[PDB]
C-alpha cells in the first residue's frame, strides 16, 4: 500500500486479483469444497483462502452496503470537504489574532513588576504585548529528546475501503 498510495474505492493489486477470482468463477469451487462433507481435508485450506480474501473489509460496514451507495458517498464527500475547510479557516484566524499586527522587527520590552525570575530579580519580557494574554513560561522550550529504546509501540496498519464492485461481490460470497 506504501507503493500504491491509492484513494479509497480504487482497486489495489489484491482487489483486482480478487475481482479476477470472481470473473473466473473460481469462488464457486471454494463454496463446493466448503459445503461438501467428504472434502473435509480440503476445507482446512479453504478456510485460509477465504480468510485471506476478506482482510480489508470489516463485516459491519460490509453488511451496510447497497445499490444507492453512489449518491451517498458523493454527497457525504462534499460535506466532509466542507467541514475540513471550515476547521482550517477557524484555526488560522485564532493564530492571526494572537500574533501582533506590526512586523517582526518592531521590538519593545516590558518588565513584569513583582514576578520574580529563577534569579533574584523580576522577569524581563521581550515578546509582543498580545502574547501575555495566554502566557506560560515553557513556550520557548524544545521537547525532551527520547532514547531510541524508550519509544512505545505503534500501528503498522490503516483503515481502507475497496471498490464498490468488489464490496458487492464480497457481500454476496
Amino acid at each position: 500500500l506504501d507503493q500504491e498510495k491509492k484513494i479509497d474505492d480504487d482497486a489495489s493489486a489484491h482487489d483486482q486479483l480478487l475481482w479476477a477470482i470472481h470473473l473466473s468463477g473460481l469462488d464457486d469451487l471454494l463454496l463446493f469444497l466448503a459445503s461438501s462433507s467428504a472434502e473435509e481435508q480440503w476445507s482446512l485450506h479453504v478456510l485460509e483462502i477465504v480468510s485471506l480474501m476478506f482482510r480489508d473489509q470489516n463485516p459491519e460496514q460490509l453488511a451496510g452496503v447497497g445499490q444507492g451507495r453512489l449518491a451517498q458517498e458523493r454527497s457525504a464527500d462534499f460535506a466532509e470537504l466542507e467541514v475540513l475547510r471550515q476547521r482550517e479557516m477557524a484555526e488560522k484566524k485564532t493564530r492571526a489574532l494572537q500574533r501582533g499586527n506590526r512586523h517582526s522587527r518592531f521590538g519593545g520590552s516590558y518588565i513584569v513588576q513583582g514576578l520574580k525570575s529563577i534569579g533574584e530579580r523580576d522577569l524581563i519580557f521581550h515578546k509582543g504585548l498580545h502574547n501575555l494574554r495566554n502566557y506560560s513560561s515553557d513556550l520557548g522550550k524544545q521537547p525532551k529528546k527520547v532514547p531510541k529504546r524508550r519509544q512505545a509501540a505503534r500501528e503498522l496498519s490503516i483503515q481502507r475501503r475497496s471498490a464498490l464492485n468488489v464490496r458487492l461481490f464480497l457481500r454476496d460470497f
Binding site: 520590552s109 525570575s117 529563577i118 534569579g119 530579580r121 523580576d122 522577569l123 524581563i124 521581550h126 520557548g140
Partner: protein, 223 residues
C-alpha cells in the same frame, strides 16, 4: 617606566592648584571652575592647555608630547576622581539614556558607561605646524600639529562605545566596552544561574541602554 600613580597625583595637583592669574588677575583657578561646571553637567568637553602645564613642569609636557595616548587616559581618570569634590548640587533628569542609568542605580543600591565628558589637549606654543609631507614615520604615537586645506567631509554618524544586553530568563544585564574599529557581539548568557542550570537563555541588545558618540570623517590636502 614611570609610576603612573605618582603621575596621577601630580596631574591632580595641577588641576587642584593651578591659577592663570585668571579672571582679570583675581586668581579664580580656571580648571577648578571648569570642574564645577563639569560636575553640574553645564559643559561636556574640557581642553587642557599644555602651556599652563609648562609653567610648573616642562618635563611633564615633554612626557605628554611622546606617547600622548597614555596621558589622555591618565588625565581622564584624574578628572573623574576629582569631580565629586566640586559638586554641591543635584542635577535634573533630562535624557532617556540617563533614565536607564538612573534605573540601574535604583536597582543596584563599568565606569566607562557613566563617564559623560571629553578631555582634549591644546598644543604647546613651542610646536610650529608641519606640512603634510613632513609627518614621517618617526612621529607615530606623538602629538603633532598640521596645516592644510579641507577637501571632503561626511555626515555625522552614531559610533558605538559600550553595548548593553538583557537576558530573557534571569533578568540580568551585561556590558561590553568597544575600542577597536570592529567587534563581535555576545550571544548566550554568562551569568552563574543560567550557566549552572544550562538553561540556554539568549541575549538581546538594547539601543535604549548602550552609549553612542557623534563621529565624522574628513580629508585634508597640501597647499
Amino acid at each position: 617606566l614611570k609610576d603612573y600613580a605618582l603621575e596621577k597625583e601630580k596631574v591632580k595637583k595641577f588641576l587642584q592648584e593651578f591659577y592663570q592669574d585668571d579672571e582679570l588677575g583675581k586668581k579664580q583657578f580656571k580648571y577648578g571652575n571648569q570642574l564645577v561646571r563639569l560636575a553640574h553637567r553645564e559643559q561636556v568637553a574640557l581642553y587642557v592647555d599644555l602651556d599652563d602645564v609648562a609653567e610648573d613642569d616642562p618635563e611633564l609636557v615633554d612626557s605628554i608630547c611622546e606617547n600622548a595616548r597614555r596621558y589622555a587616559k591618565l588625565f581622564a581618570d584624574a578628572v573623574q576622581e576629582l569631580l565629586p569634590q566640586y559638586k554641591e548640587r543635584e542635577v535634573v533628569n533630562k535624557d532617556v539614556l540617563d533614565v536607564y542609568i538612573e534605573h540601574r542605580l535604583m536597582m543596584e543600591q563599568p565606569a566607562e558607561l557613566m563617564r559623560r565628558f571629553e578631555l582634549y589637549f591644546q598644543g604647546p606654543s613651542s610646536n610650529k605646524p608641519r606640512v603634510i609631507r613632513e609627518v614621517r614615520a618617526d612621529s607615530v604615537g606623538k602629538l603633532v600639529t598640521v596645516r592644510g586645506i579641507v577637501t571632503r567631509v561626511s555626515e555625522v554618524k552614531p559610533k558605538m562605545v559600550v553595548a548593553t544586553y538583557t537576558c530573557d530568563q534571569c533578568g540580568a544585564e551585561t556590558y561590553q566596552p568597544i575600542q577597536s574599529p570592529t567587534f563581535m557581539p555576545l550571544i548566550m548568557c554568562p551569568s552563574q544561574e543560567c550557566q549552572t542550570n544550562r538553561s540556554g537563555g539568549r541575549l538581546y541588545l538594547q539601543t535604549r541602554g548602550s552609549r553612542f558618540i557623534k563621529f565624522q570623517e574628513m580629508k585634508m590636502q597640501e597647499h
